[PDB]
Amino acid sequence: MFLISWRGYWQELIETLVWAHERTPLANLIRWRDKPVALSIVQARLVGLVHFSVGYILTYAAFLIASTSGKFG
Amino acid sequence: SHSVKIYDTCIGCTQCVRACPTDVLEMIPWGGCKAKQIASAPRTEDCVGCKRCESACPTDFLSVRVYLWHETTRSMGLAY
Amino acid sequence: AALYTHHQYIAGFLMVGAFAHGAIFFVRDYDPELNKNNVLARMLEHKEAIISHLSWASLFLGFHTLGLYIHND
Amino acid sequence: KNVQIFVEKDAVETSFEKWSQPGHFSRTLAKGPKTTTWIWNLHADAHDFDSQTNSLEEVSRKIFSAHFGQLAAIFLWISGMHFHGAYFSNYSAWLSDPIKIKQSSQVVWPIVGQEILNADVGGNFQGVQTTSGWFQMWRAEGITSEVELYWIAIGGLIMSALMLFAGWFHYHKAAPKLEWFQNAESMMNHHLAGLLGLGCLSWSGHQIHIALPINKLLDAGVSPQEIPLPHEFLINRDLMAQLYPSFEKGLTPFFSGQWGVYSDFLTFKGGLNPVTGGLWLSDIAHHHLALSVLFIIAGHMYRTNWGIGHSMKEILEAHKGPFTGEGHKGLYEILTTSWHAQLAINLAMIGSLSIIVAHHMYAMPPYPYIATDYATQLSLFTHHMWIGGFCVVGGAAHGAIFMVRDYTPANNYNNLLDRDLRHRDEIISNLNWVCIFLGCHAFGFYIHNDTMRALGRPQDMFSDKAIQLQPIFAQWIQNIHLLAPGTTAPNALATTSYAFGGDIVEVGGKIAMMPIKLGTADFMVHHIHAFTIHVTVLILLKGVLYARSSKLIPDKANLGFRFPCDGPGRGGTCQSSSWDHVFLGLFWMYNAISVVIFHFSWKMQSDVWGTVTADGSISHITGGNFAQSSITINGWLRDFLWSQASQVIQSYGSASSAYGLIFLGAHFIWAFSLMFLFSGRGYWQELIESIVWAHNKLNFAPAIQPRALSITQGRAVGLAHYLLGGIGTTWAFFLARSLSIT
Amino acid sequence: DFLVHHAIALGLHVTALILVKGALDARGSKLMPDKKDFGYSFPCDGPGRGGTCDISAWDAFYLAMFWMLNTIG
Amino acid sequence: PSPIFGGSTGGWLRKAQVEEKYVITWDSPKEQIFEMPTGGAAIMREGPNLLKLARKEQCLALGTRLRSKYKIKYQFYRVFPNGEVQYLHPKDGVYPEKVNAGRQGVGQNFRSIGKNVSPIEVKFTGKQPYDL
Amino acid sequence: GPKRGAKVKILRKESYWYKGTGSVVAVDQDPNTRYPVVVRFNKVNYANVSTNNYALDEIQEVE
Amino acid sequence: DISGLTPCKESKQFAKREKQALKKLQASLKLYADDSAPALAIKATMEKTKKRFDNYGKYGLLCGSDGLPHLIVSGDQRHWGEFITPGILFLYIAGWIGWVGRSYLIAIRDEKKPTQKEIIIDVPLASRLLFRGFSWPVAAYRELLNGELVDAAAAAAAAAAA
Numbered sequence A: 001m002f003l004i005s006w007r008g009y010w011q012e013l014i015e016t017l018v019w020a021h022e023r024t025p026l027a028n029l030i031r032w033r034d035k036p037v038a039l040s041i042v043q044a045r046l047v048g049l050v051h052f053s054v055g056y057i058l059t060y061a062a063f064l065i066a067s068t069s070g071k072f073g
Numbered sequence B: 001s002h003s004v005k006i007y008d009t010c011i012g013c014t015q016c017v018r019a020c021p022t023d024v025l026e027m028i029p030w031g032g033c034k035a036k037q038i039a040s041a042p043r044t045e046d047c048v049g050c051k052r053c054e055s056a057c058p059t060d061f062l063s064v065r066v067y068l069w070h071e072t073t074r075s076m077g078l079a080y
Numbered sequence C: 001a002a003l004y005t006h007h008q009y010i011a012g013f014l015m016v017g018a019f020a021h022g023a024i025f026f027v028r029d030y031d032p033e034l035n036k037n038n039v040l041a042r043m044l045e046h047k048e049a050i051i052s053h054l055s056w057a058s059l060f061l062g063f064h065t066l067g068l069y070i071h072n073d
Numbered sequence D: 001k002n003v004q005i006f007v008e009k010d011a012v013e014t015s016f017e018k019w020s021q022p023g024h025f026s027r028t029l030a031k032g033p034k035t036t037t038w039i040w041n042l043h044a045d046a047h048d049f050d051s052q053t054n055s056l057e058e059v060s061r062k063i064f065s066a067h068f069g070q071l072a073a074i075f076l077w078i079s080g081m082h083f084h085g086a087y088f089s090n091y092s093a094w095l096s097d098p099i100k101i102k103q104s105s106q107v108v109w110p111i112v113g114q115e116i117l118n119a120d121v122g123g124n125f126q127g128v129q130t131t132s133g134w135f136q137m138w139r140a141e142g143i144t145s146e147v148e149l150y151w152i153a154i155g156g157l158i159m160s161a162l163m164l165f166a167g168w169f170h171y172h173k174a175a176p177k178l179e180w181f182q183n184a185e186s187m188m189n190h191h192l193a194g195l196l197g198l199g200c201l202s203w204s205g206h207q208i209h210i211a212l213p214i215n216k217l218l219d220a221g222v223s224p225q226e227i228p229l230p231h232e233f234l235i236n237r238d239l240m241a242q243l244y245p246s247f248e249k250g251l252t253p254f255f256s257g258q259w260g261v262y263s264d265f266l267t268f269k270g271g272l273n274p275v276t277g278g279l280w281l282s283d284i285a286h287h288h289l290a291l292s293v294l295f296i297i298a299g300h301m302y303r304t305n306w307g308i309g310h311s312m313k314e315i316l317e318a319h320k321g322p323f324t325g326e327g328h329k330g331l332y333e334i335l336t337t338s339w340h341a342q343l344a345i346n347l348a349m350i351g352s353l354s355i356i357v358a359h360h361m362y363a364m365p366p367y368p369y370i371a372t373d374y375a376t377q378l379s380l381f382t383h384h385m386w387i388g389g390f391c392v393v394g395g396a397a398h399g400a401i402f403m404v405r406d407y408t409p410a411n412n413y414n415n416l417l418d419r420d421l422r423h424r425d426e427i428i429s430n431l432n433w434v435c436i437f438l439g440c441h442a443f444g445f446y447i448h449n450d451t452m453r454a455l456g457r458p459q460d461m462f463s464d465k466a467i468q469l470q471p472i473f474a475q476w477i478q479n480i481h482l483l484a485p486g487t488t489a490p491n492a493l494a495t496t497s498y499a500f501g502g503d504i505v506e507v508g509g510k511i512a513m514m515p516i517k518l519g520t521a522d523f524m525v526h527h528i529h530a531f532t533i534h535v536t537v538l539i540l541l542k543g544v545l546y547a548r549s550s551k552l553i554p555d556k557a558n559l560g561f562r563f564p565c566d567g568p569g570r571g572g573t574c575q576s577s578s579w580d581h582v583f584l585g586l587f588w589m590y591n592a593i594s595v596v597i598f599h600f601s602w603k604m605q606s607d608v609w610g611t612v613t614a615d616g617s618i619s620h621i622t623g624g625n626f627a628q629s630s631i632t633i634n635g636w637l638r639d640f641l642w643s644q645a646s647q648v649i650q651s652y653g654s655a656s657s658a659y660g661l662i663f664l665g666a667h668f669i670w671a672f673s674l675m676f677l678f679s680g681r682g683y684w685q686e687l688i689e690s691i692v693w694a695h696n697k698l699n700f701a702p703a704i705q706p707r708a709l710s711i712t713q714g715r716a717v718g719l720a721h722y723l724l725g726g727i728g729t730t731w732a733f734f735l736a737r738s739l740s741i742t
Numbered sequence E: 001d002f003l004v005h006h007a008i009a010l011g012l013h014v015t016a017l018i019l020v021k022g023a024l025d026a027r028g029s030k031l032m033p034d035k036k037d038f039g040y041s042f043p044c045d046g047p048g049r050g051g052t053c054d055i056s057a058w059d060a061f062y063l064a065m066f067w068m069l070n071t072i073g
Numbered sequence F: 001p002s003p004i005f006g007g008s009t010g011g012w013l014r015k016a017q018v019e020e021k022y023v024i025t026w027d028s029p030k031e032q033i034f035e036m037p038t039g040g041a042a043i044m045r046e047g048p049n050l051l052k053l054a055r056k057e058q059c060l061a062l063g064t065r066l067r068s069k070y071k072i073k074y075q076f077y078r079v080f081p082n083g084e085v086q087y088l089h090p091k092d093g094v095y096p097e098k099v100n101a102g103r104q105g106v107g108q109n110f111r112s113i114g115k116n117v118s119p120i121e122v123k124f125t126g127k128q129p130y131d132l
Numbered sequence G: 001g002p003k004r005g006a007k008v009k010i011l012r013k014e015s016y017w018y019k020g021t022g023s024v025v026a027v028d029q030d031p032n033t034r035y036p037v038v039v040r041f042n043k044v045n046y047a048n049v050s051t052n053n054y055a056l057d058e059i060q061e062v063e
Numbered sequence H: 001d002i003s004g005l006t007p008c009k010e011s012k013q014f015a016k017r018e019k020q021a022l023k024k025l026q027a028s029l030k031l032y033a034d035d036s037a038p039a040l041a042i043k044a045t046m047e048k049t050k051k052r053f054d055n056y057g058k059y060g061l062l063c064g065s066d067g068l069p070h071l072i073v074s075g076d077q078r079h080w081g082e083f084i085t086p087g088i089l090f091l092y093i094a095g096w097i098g099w100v101g102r103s104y105l106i107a108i109r110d111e112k113k114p115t116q117k118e119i120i121i122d123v124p125l126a127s128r129l130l131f132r133g134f135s136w137p138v139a140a141y142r143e144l145l146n147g148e149l150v151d152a153a154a155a156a157a158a159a160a161a162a
């Protein structure tokens, strides 16, 4: 998701969410202190990379350990 | 804010100023080229950083140059 | 099986981190006037050779190793 | 008269001059290539007729003649198929025993050991098993002989050359004016009454006189040979009255208004044919008759040259409420001066139609002997799901091309179009919520089941044994359809489909149809369907509404339909264009349709398909594992994907080994796509510069300078390989799995 | 054992190609002769003069990560 | 003197009454329909027209559409929450694309671009190569 | 220096056409111009531009 | 022999592969009548298969314990037909294409529109050039020791770095 879909798709989406939150009664009493924005170009690559990496390593660890211990030979 | 620098290879053909979507650059008097005019960056704080000015510059390499800088509400391009 | 694949994956991160910091050196640490005609400077002077030749070896291994596997399939 | 014929004579000279000058159609490409980007632009812009000329009349002439070229390729395609069925098939041997002989219309040449693909199919014949249902469609027409298929093949070639000639005639010799094209009310009267109405009338005529009596003799047990020539059914009423004893009356009970005499051929019995497992042809003949009367009457609703009738303009302009403001004013100029707005409706409709078509052909199988051919059932169903999927998103692409190019604000002050754009932040933010609401619930039902089961607590899972989620609304509707024959439809003998309940139909020991019970495992999957459609709509809708501007880019419409970005400022502008919205939504349509065909392939194999023995002992294909194995992701991964893979992975050395190769080949192409989707252009163009250097060093370089693929293009490559590899891997998995169980 | 070794060879060469190209072109290229002025990591140079996604030396590291994971795999 | 518009949900947010808001003025010889940068359509009023927007780009984007599409010409203002106004476009009444005697040089390096220093030379300083 | 029509080699390092040859078209005689020499080329750069201005110390003459 | 391999004519496992490949096609042949097209096709397939095993037996190839032929690329001259002789053959055809294609680019370079002749081939000129690469090892050698093969270092554009 972070590697194929880029930023200006996401920036436009959040602008409708900032709008919605500002127009709904009883949710208007609360407000962010940091303007919500979409992750940047280089930040999306690093995050998409960490997911691809952590997912890559955890699924092989899962396979190699239980296929050996489940057969023991 | 962002940083916009203008080099001396500027031939003064006003194309960066016509491309700027947030009125950052302007043309000023200059006596170093045929057109006697050089680009200038007097309002870099409205600069959003979209680099349309560099896509318009005909010189090789570019005369106008945009460098990423600390972001405010104006350069982030926020309407909220 | 856990041990061999643990040190091979860590070996990969270390290797990739070595070249990553090798690039950082050239950007904000390399001084061209200090290494005039140096063994380090000459590497940049034929950088197109290294890259284009590394590209040939890669294309060669890829075409034949992949082609042989598909022929057997 | 307002509806007339206006044609320009000798509009375009026909010469080979322009053929030798690639890029003649556009102003920028006609200068010639300087870089390799030019070669790519040549193809991306060839059919963009709107950007080649400014005249609407010249765009319309190009489109009209291109339709003739598209149809001529379809006639050639149809003529081929009939030719293959007549010279490279086992049609005759299949007609004599369509329960044991497998179908095949393709034979491969023996050259590199590939003859193994000629399977041992039966009837002293060897070939590739084809799953298009040509055979079943031919039997329903009352084919019975290869000679008849040969005439269709010659007639398909003649029609194909007639189309090629008409497209050349209408673009060069007799080019019709703009006034001719802008006749919507005339055009609607002709397509409803002429194309659809007379099409159903004549087809019904073929079914009553040729297809009905031949099928009756085939079904009773008469060998094809003993059946007389089709034309002999048109001459001797004696032959026709033996099968349907109401031809002795002739045509007189039709003009006397006594139509119940024909209850022999105009039935309303419902159900299927116990012998063939297909719909009753007599019902299908009644179906086309009732259609054709409806289509011909509907083709009188518009006003052309005689006062009577409706003008499309006064209809739409009368519809305005106090919420809608001006209502439908302006939608005429739109839909009669822009081809993009037309496709946007049309592709969305035709794509929805192909989805609708696939749902009705597995539940009420219309051809004989097709319901027990599970390879055909599975192949035909997924095919229309894919064609439907691509056409639906293609309607949304043209909706956004219309907003950028043909849309003007002055033509639409305060109408429905202007108003949607005014609260576009509200449609998108509300849809956005419905998407976050549907995903957390429908997909979280599976996670809960995955963790509960893994923790050793099956008593707490969402299942038919724990916390039930019964689809009571759909179960309620099933009962209505079951009790409908006699009560709500008092003249109907049986239910439309046996899916809503009833009896079990069987042909040759295989199950054709059975009631499809819905439980909580059904319920959970239907929400996944709900959820993936809502997300796909979120991307495409957003692309159309924000095609012209946003808070991010106020002048998006000046940048065009497809631009890569507006630079690395204003945070990230990547994929802001409405073309990139189409690009993203293609990955969702893919995601949505993949779950649909997975749901269909598994539910039919678990709960319908199978064989039987004495005392009605039903043995399903996967043995009824659908209620307790599809509620978790692990169950979907282990019982659907892992278990049913055994065919395609063990197909080597057999006749279905091409499916094993295409399986790997599409896993390779899918991975190949990720190189284009994850990377970007400026790493590739620097790579090319070191390569060009090695050429320059050896005194040579191409004068057409090599340039990396552009930003937009590198995305369109990665998406085309992603679909090709993804859909392909499933294509190979579905056919090698269903040929082994049929 | 012979075919896999040539696949392992291919993996090492392509990974090296991306890392060596990223280090040597870190200071500049034909498409961006003043790359050292922007540092090690930056988004791109905009859509000008063709378009410049993944031009920074940091991007070479990000692309190489996929190859390390693949050739250790 | 606001133009004819039925409203839309794409207008200003809290940022307007809390952070700077922008207005744009133009003069039209006749009543014509134009496109809103945040909204689909609106009828401009003959005589002076006043429009409030949330961004400088949105204001400048309207100017561009007012210029080469209608032949008219406008002024931008920055309005603060206290009430102080600023005059922005055109800065000195003359458009930035046309040279005007009296302007000065801001941000100009007096050499070509290949003449910047190495980043190792400005080590441990609080600058950059392009600020020398 | 060059004249009109002379074939020169570019010595600017950040130019697209460094070490590459091309043809002088116009030399500005007014020395207030810093880059007086229009040099044309038959191959385009990445921005599809075919020409550029240079100084006299940045071009070499071929023969 | 090399690597403990045995020749294929003396491998017990290579002979079993030959039998089982023929048995599989014979058991498929029995379901057809003798004059018909499927019986003539499978009979021709067993001839092609039987000639494939005979060919290898006398070929001089090496088999393993798996019963399959192996190839030796150390450079032994006794197993030349396996890599050397088809290797010299490929080099002749691959170097023929690269040489001929390069001659074309260099020829149409000195022209008003060189790019025009890369999308639209001057076929009479191209046809002439294609067959002049039959003596490329002599033609590529004359230009190496002339100066017309490789250009000088001041003629290649280089990245700012070096």
Ligand code: CLA
Pocket: C055, C058, C059, C060, C061, C062, C063, C064, C066, C067, D668, D671, D672, D673, D674, D675, D676, D678, D679, D687, E014, E017, E018, E063, E064, E066
């Ligand atoms: C399976 C998926 C896949 C494949 C096949 C490749 C293939 C390739 N990538 Mg890679 N890449 C991938 C995924 C993949 N990528 C992913 C996920 C990423 C992360 C974004 C990248 C990122 C990436 C980068 C950064 C780099 C590569 C490079 C390369 C090339 C390596 C050289 C080579 O192997 O030559 C062999 C060529 C192939 C294997 C391509 C297939 C060609 C087929 C048609 C040949 C058929 C076999 C045989 C020859 C048939 C004869 C042909 C017939 C006409 C006679 C090659 C084109 C590098 C490169 O381009 O250097 C040259 C490079 O720098 N890729």
Ligand code: CLA
Pocket: D076, D077, D079, D080, D081, D083, D088, D106, D107, D108, D109
């Ligand atoms: C369009 C649908 C269609 C498709 C997909 C097929 C597919 C096939 N047919 Mg078939 N066929 C069709 C329609 C179709 N046909 C029709 C309508 C007829 C009746 C006319 C036939 C008659 C027919 C016969 C008699 C036979 C086949 C056979 C075959 C198979 C082998 C074909 C082959 O390899 O030839 C190879 C073809 C070539 C090598 C020709 C090369 C074409 C190149 C040069 C392209 C040239 C384009 C050129 C550059 C354009 C320049 C334009 C300029 C001249 C104006 C293949 C499965 C054979 C078969 O099934 O064997 C058992 C066979 O014997 N077909």
Ligand code: CLA
Pocket: H093, H096, H097, H100, H129, H130, H131, H134
């Ligand atoms: C897919 C694999 C493949 C293969 C196997 C080939 C093979 C070939 N290509 Mg092709 N090619 C390919 C792919 C391939 N190509 C691809 C992907 C491209 C890119 C599009 C090309 C582009 C291409 C070009 C442009 C050309 C070729 C040419 C050739 C041929 C060069 C060798 C030759 O002409 O015969 C060998 C000929 C000889 C050994 C003759 C020896 C010399 C004579 C004087 C000796 C006479 C001896 C005497 C007659 C013996 C009789 C004596 C008697 C007593 C017995 C060869 C047949 C060339 C060609 O077709 O030739 C005109 C050519 O110009 N190729």
Ligand code: CLA
Pocket: A050, A054, C013, C014, C016, C017, C018, C020, C024, E040, E041, E058, E061
């Ligand atoms: C002894 C080894 C060593 C040392 C001293 C450094 C030191 C440094 N590196 Mg470095 N590096 C190393 C190894 C090392 N690295 C290796 C092995 C690699 C290869 C992966 C890299 C790749 C690398 C890059 C690409 C970059 C650096 C940078 C830097 C500098 C700043 C780092 C920073 O701000 O981190 C900040 C710390 C973080 C961002 C925390 C990140 C945590 C990551 C994402 C993992 C978290 C995921 C989590 C574990 C998932 C949980 C899973 C669970 C749910 C199951 C610093 C000088 C950066 C720089 O600016 O240099 C100029 C830079 O761009 N390095």
Ligand code: CLA
Pocket: D063, D064, D067, D068, D071, D180, D181, D183, D186, D187, D190, D191, D194, D195
């Ligand atoms: C009764 C009259 C009639 C009929 C049958 C059609 C039929 C058709 N029109 Mg059409 N049209 C009509 C009147 C009619 N039009 C009029 C009056 C206008 C002017 C307002 C138009 C303007 C128009 C346009 C602008 C376009 C069409 C197109 C089409 C085709 C739609 C594609 C399709 O479904 O393919 C189904 C295909 C077939 C059923 C094959 C039929 C092929 C020919 C045409 C046979 C019909 C002739 C004749 C009635 C047959 C007699 C049968 C004989 C036994 C008695 C279809 C062939 C589109 C197209 O594709 O154009 C090429 C298109 O772009 N029409």
Ligand code: CLA
Pocket: D043, D044, D045, D046, D047, D048, D049, D347, D390, D391, D392, D393, D394, D395, D397, D401, D562, D579, D582, D720
């Ligand atoms: C009736 C259907 C129809 C029609 C007439 C059009 C017509 C048009 N579309 Mg459109 N479109 C459609 C359906 C349709 N589309 C669908 C279903 C989608 C969703 C996928 C789209 C998505 C779409 C986009 C996203 C865009 C268009 C564009 C265009 C315009 C130019 C197209 C062009 O030049 O392409 C030339 C044709 C090609 C380059 C052919 C390449 C096709 C693919 C890559 C190959 C297909 C693979 C093949 C089937 C299998 C390969 C197997 C392998 C082994 C070889 C033109 C007005 C473009 C435009 O500018 O609009 C004005 C544009 O940006 N359309």
Ligand code: CLA
Pocket: A001, A002, A004, A005, A009, D432, D433, D435, D436, D437, D438, D439, D440, D441, D443, D444, D447, D535, D538, D539, D584, D587, D588
């Ligand atoms: C498996 C991969 C994956 C997943 C999980 C997602 C997830 C999502 N994508 Mg997608 N996306 C993907 C791949 C994926 N994507 C790919 C490959 C692409 C490239 C084409 C994209 C492109 C893309 C676009 C373009 C869009 C999305 C959208 C969405 C969101 C849908 C809304 C929703 O229901 O969120 C809910 C979350 C889930 C369904 C996943 C987890 C469910 C959890 C388990 C239940 C609730 C957990 C709870 C809240 C937290 C408790 C746990 C915590 C305490 C530990 C969601 C965040 C759309 C969006 O934002 O619309 C709203 C949208 O427009 N994505």
Ligand SMILES: CC1=C(C/C=C(\C)CCC[C@H](C)CCC[C@H](C)CCCC(C)C)C(=O)c2ccccc2C1=O
Pocket: D675, D676, D677, D679, D680, D681, D684, D707, D708, D709, D710, D711, D713, D714, D715
């Ligand atoms: C690899 C890659 C390239 C390099 C690809 C290029 C330059 C295109 C090469 C296409 C060739 C020239 C067409 C001919 C195809 C092959 C010569 C033949 C392969 C087909 C086989 C079946 C034989 C990009 O330009 C690019 C741009 C933007 C994002 C990602 C990428 C990207 O991932």
Ligand code: SF4
Pocket: B004, B019, B020, B021, B022, B023, B024, B025, B046, B047, B048, B049, B050, B051, B052, B053, B054, B066, D569
């Ligand atoms: S970066 Fe964009 S906003 Fe800033 S001066 Fe350049 S073109 Fe104008």
Ligand code: SF4
Pocket: B009, B010, B011, B012, B013, B014, B015, B016, B017, B038, B039, B056, B057, B058, B059, B063, B064
């Ligand atoms: S910087 Fe470029 S666009 Fe601006 S005046 Fe100079 S040459 Fe013209």
Ligand code: SF4
Pocket: A041, D564, D565, D566, D567, D568, D569, D572, D573, D574, D575, D680, D711, E043, E044, E045, E046, E047, E051, E052, E053, E054
């Ligand atoms: S990554 Fe590419 S598309 Fe995105 S801003 Fe940078 S140059 Fe433009």
